[PDB]
Every structure is written in C-alpha cells, then in structure tokens.
Write a protein that holds these residues in place. Structure first.
Motif: not given
Length: 159
Positions: A63-76
């Motif tokens: 059984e699937c579950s939707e998962l979201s992530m927000v990746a922010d630009k670092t200083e590299k």
C-alpha cells in the motif's frame, strides 16, 4: 546532453516533471530496505526559484502513501537540503534530463552519517549501461555493490 547540478551548465528547470526510482543504494542498507525511511519511489519533481518539491510514495505492505519534500538550495552550488529523518543535503552529480538522473545524498541524524545514491528514470526502467555507470559511481562513494538495490520491477502498491 549530460550535466551535474554542481557543474556550470546545469539547467534545473529541465529536471522538472515525472520520474521513477530505478535503483537506490546506501552505505547503510537498512535505510533503503523494506520499510526503510529512504526506500522512496520518486514520482515528480516541481522546480521552484530557490527550491525543489519532490513527490514520492512510500510502501508499507503493498500500500502506497504519498510523501512530499521541499528541498531548498544551500550555499553550495547545485546542492539542496531537506529535513527528513534527519538533516539531508544532496546534489545531482549527473543527469541527461530526458532519461536518467543520479542523485547523491548525505544524511545526518544527530551523531551518525550515511550516504545514499539514487538512480531515477523518465521511464520505469533504464539500460544496463546506465545502471552500471551508476553502480561505479556508488563504489566511488564507498557504497558496496551488495548495497545497491534495483527497484525496477518493484510493482509495489496494488493491494
């Protein structure tokens, strides 16, 4: 055309859209094994000005579950960070935009650190030549071949 996110010619807008988890690899295998927090099936990448929205599905007993992530630009350059089961930073060492994308992630969870490598495809699978290139990259990062898991035929979710 091939490029790395850390390189000079990266065009992040081009990685936007549908993707599929083809292979996952980690120096801490448990993290990508059944029920592991990083056994994530990427489905979509939405590109924002200073961020990336990653859309995944996790699997627990067919059984699937939707998962979201927000990746922010670092200083590299070409690096992103996201809080998820610890502090994560990742880059895209290589992608050709319309077929494959290789991501390298480093996770820190107060104390221990582990590396994860991910191979994603515009289609549910990728050629052996590409999977091998990925495997060699995993080795260069100290990830054993036996810690590389091909999830191509993981027809997960369909209870």
């Amino acid at each position: 055309e091939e490029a790395s996110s850390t390189g000079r010619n990266f065009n992040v807008e081009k990685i936007n859209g549908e993707w599929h988890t083809i292979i996952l690899a980690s120096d801490k295998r448990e993290k990508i094994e059944d029920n592991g927090n990083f056994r994530l099936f990427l489905e979509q990448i939405h590109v924002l000005e200073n961020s990336l929205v990653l859309k995944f599905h996790t699997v627990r007993d067919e059984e699937c579950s939707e998962l979201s992530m927000v990746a922010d630009k670092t200083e590299k350059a070409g690096e992103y960070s996201v809080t998820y089961d610890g502090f994560n930073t990742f880059t895209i060492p290589k992608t050709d935009y319309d077929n494959f994308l290789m991501a390298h992630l480093i996770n820190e969870k107060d104390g221990e650190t582990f590396q994860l490598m991910g191979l994603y495809g515009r289609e549910p699978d990728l050629s052996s030549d590409i999977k091998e290139r990925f495997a060699q990259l995993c080795e260069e990062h100290g990830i054993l071949r036996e810690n590389i898991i091909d999830l191509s035929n993981a027809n997960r979710c369909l209870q």
